[PDB]
Amino acid sequence: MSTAEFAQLLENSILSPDQNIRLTSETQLKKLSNDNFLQFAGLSSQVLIDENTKLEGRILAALTLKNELVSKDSVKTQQFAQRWITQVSPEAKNQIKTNALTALVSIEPRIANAAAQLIAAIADIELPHGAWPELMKIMVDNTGAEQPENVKRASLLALGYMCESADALVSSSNNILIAIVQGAQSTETSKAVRLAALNALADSLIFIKNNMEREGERNYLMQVVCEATQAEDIEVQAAAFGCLCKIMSKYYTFMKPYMEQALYALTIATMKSPNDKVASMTVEFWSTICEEEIDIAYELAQFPQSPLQSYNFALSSIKDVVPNLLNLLTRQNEDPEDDDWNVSMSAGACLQLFAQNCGNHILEPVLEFVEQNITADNWRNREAAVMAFGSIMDGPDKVQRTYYVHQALPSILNLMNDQSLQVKETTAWCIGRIADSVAESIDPQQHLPGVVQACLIGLQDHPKVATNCSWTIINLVEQLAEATPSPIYNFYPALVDGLIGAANRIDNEFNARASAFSALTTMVEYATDTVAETSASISTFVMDKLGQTMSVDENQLTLEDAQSLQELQSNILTVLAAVIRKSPSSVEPVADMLMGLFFRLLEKKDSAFIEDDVFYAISALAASLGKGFEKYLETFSPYLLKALNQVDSPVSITAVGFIADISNSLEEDFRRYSDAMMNVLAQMISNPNARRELKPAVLSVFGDIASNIGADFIPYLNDIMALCVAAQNTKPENGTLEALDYQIKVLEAVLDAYVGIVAGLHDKPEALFPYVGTIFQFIAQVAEDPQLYSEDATSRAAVGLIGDIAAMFPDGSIKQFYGQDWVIDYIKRTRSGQLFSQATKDTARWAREQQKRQLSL
């Protein structure tokens, strides 16, 4: 194959506007890789350095050869390693390598970058076997100061990648570290080279551990990275802080001296910087510090002997750092609806970490700030204050938080009347941070009313504000209703009323509508009898609303308009599902409404988005109505089969569940729908796409059906006996946790099936007769395996089968089973000790007596 023809495939793979060309070209490249890897590799290396090929094709040449050399999968990596070693001729190896090194020094940086990636990939394969010994010297020599900017840059880059994926390299580590750090020191190297070095150091941090664990090398390295923080170039600073963060994460242990001697002072200074990017960089450093100190606290709690110890950098710095962080909270975006992440948001995150890490020690500086800005001229100050307060609602102990919440709440609640949108937005959030973390700090008689009033104001305000109030109401209802004398219900009508107002918003701008529906869902989740009239107002509202959305089907408006509508119908269904899973009392009277609406929903096109939700909702409604659901079963049947057949989806499992319930609520009348269900159920389990969870669900539902359906199950009896005989002889997939607990789940579901079958066929012994041996064989496994027999319920079932089966064959047709030793011995084990409850022992008595009659026939 020509190098030019190969180059055209590569260009076509990503540059062709024709999708069929792209697919074809990628396919042709792939088979060339499989059939003649030697040639593929070689040609790839040539297009890389081919001046006639477009950038994209040359870059792609390097990357895809690399993707045939190294891999995320650990078996593929060994396969690829071996292929390169055995299939590529020594002549081609040198040819490829030489091309890569040339490409690495290209004046076009994106080519050198890709060449850097390919070089690293080849080094992963060859360096562990002491091959490509020339490489280190090349790589280090390209880092020489006299070398041109590009040659140094891509080489440092290549060194980075090389170390990062690494498995000479080790004995060359000093030379690497020096070469990397060299390229970053000296103010007067190129920005790009200095950048490339700092990033190469980052990628290499784990692989230079032994270097980092030497005062000499570590100090040098740390000198350079610290200097780089004080670069005039912003990106170089960002790279430097980037390394500092990683170093703090990786090598916290060694950081105290550098903190004490330099970093402590450098990072206080830069935290003040009037440039937001700079202050951001350094805030992150301190967040990292807090994160690693917080994780240390967890680690000591679970390993109190650990030789690791916190240096308390945060704690020691609160006097300097926290005030400077609080100062950065007043650098918000003027534009109330910017939402772009900035240094103030970074500062807030860092303060929360400071709270969580220093606990109570955070209180003094923050409360001094809050009290002093909570009613200041500037909105920025007012907002920073309520921000600050909410940021410390997690970390300090319950006593402190309660005390200061109690003290500051009147001022906070009062800020809902502010002219500033940002202040109100953050104020509403602050309320929810109080609720979510210290609900019992809000006395029901003297605080909770002021809170509710603040939320109801905010639901009528700008949508950004109303969104937060909804989430805050959710928090309130969650952390309050868990207290036995819950005072929230006293306010349910006021809250449900204001929430509906928000749910009736013209649109869902800034999620104010979707928020409100989520709140309504929660209000319903935590409803009690006391609040039925208001819980009923919810279902009445959303049913009306759902019907309303259905008036105009989607294929009338723009895509955009349809998706906004479908979001609203999804929002409504969340509430409607929760109402049915709590108080069907308020929708049983309009059962036809819901079903009417649900059937309409499932009728129309483009329903796939709600189908499962509606199915889940119907199921739960059906559970309530019991026999009351039969009048729908007809028209619901298509959708039930639709759901059962989706064996890869969880919806099939609740479909199995739905059958369990209607088979049990109806009984002998299920016979009318029995066959169509079973024709599907008998297939499901042997479908190559069936989930794991499906099998035991189905195995057990055969039990349900058989017991309710009786003689009508017989046509399917043999087919089901095959399925749970194969199942009972199935060993664990491996030896792990789930392996056996699933296998037991299967075995318990086989037991459900036989129990249900024996129950169902009480009147029809002739039909069961051929399977007595099969069942007694399963009972042998129960008697054998402790995971089965030691479970009280499983044994009582097993030993109950022994008895019930005997009661069906009073002519000695099966008496040969009752004379076996294991059976006499199994009945005996079940009447012994405590393990087995009284109910089990009394069933074992029944089985013992039935078994004695068999022998005396």
Partner: protein, 169 residues
């Protein structure tokens, strides 16, 4: 005015679902692994005329990687998606970011935590800290409930066009 957008993330996180919805309004229920990449143009009719994202919907499964980071060539922006229901899909976010920026030097990237409609999140807002470390934009998203449906594209369009006041409606 058009831009190449590469969409990446662990398999089954909802990348194709997200895109197909934006494309046609259809919510795909079945999970069918993407084979290499599906390229589809998305147009948004903004207040400053139409903007077009040529979306490269890449495969998440190693088996079906295709050209893999070969698809990032010339990408002008990206979406990293993870599944909020699956801790491992967030654990791999840093890898997706790395493999991106090694090919696309300096581009705007949005991080999306999909499936927020599902009841019990396994990756709460507390754990989501990567946007913060690498100055990216993060959104909770749900390709099913259409939560923040248009946000990732709105943010990218603004940064790409360089106009903070760009609107979709």
């Amino acid at each position: 005015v058009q831009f190449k957008l590469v969409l990446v993330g662990d398999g089954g996180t909802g990348k194709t679902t997200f895109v197909k919805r934006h494309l046609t309004g259809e919510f795909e229920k079945k999970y069918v692994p993407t084979l290499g990449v599906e390229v589809h143009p998305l147009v948004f009719h903004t207040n400053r005329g139409p903007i077009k994202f040529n979306v490269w919907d890449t495969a998440g499964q190693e088996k079906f990687g295709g050209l893999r980071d070969g698809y990032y060539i010339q990408a002008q922006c990206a979406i990293i998606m993870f599944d909020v229901t699956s801790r491992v899909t967030y654990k791999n976010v840093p890898n997706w970011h790395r493999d991106l920026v090694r090919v696309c030097e300096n581009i705007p990237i949005v991080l999306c935590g999909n499936k927020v409609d599902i009841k019990d999140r396994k990756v709460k807002a507390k754990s989501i800290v990567f946007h913060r470390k690498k100055n990216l934009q993060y959104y909770d998203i749900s390709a099913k409930s259409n939560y923040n449906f248009e946000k990732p594209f709105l943010w990218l369009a603004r940064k790409l066009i360089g106009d903070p006041n760009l609107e979709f409606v």
